[PDB]
Amino acid sequence: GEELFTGVVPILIELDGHVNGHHFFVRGEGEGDATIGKLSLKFIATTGKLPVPWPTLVTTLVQCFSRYPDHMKRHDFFKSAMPEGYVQERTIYFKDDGTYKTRAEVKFEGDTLVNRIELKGIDFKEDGNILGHKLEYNFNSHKVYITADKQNNGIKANFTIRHNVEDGSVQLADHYQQNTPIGDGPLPDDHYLSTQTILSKDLNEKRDHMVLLEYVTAAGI
């Protein structure tokens, strides 16, 4: 299934979310180029103004597009599960605030890589950093640490996302992550993904939205 990631692949992403009393929905469309580890997407909040900040959704909103160097192709679980795909479950702990629980299917549908996600958020403080919107519009660079568990024939991962706050603070988000294949036949040595993300806006776009450009490369061997 690494075959399927030579050349540009279009992308569709859908987020169904409930945080406390608010429901929201997000559609993303764009393309991904696994050959250089690049992502280009635009996101729309089809339900009005987001009750959370856009940066808090970035990680739950396709690591099959991580560029794996030639000498690491043995370790690319994400692609090797395609086209049938994989399940990606996360729990995300915002320090001294609420929590996200996310489930999502990442899989091919025609020539389009699809990420369909549902998200549950509980115990977020009103006038905390997430609700009441005190996060700055940007995104830091991280290392995503990946291990195999042969148990669920898949991939576990954890890492800490650092969210700049508008007063110089840093809101931390602890990510706990599992990945499980849907079909059959895919398991790496310990390694990581260095990430980079720029956020921006379409100035002629009136719906609450997010333009995102992202670079990712594997390393550790």
Ligand SMILES: [Cu+2]
């Ligand atoms: Cu719903």
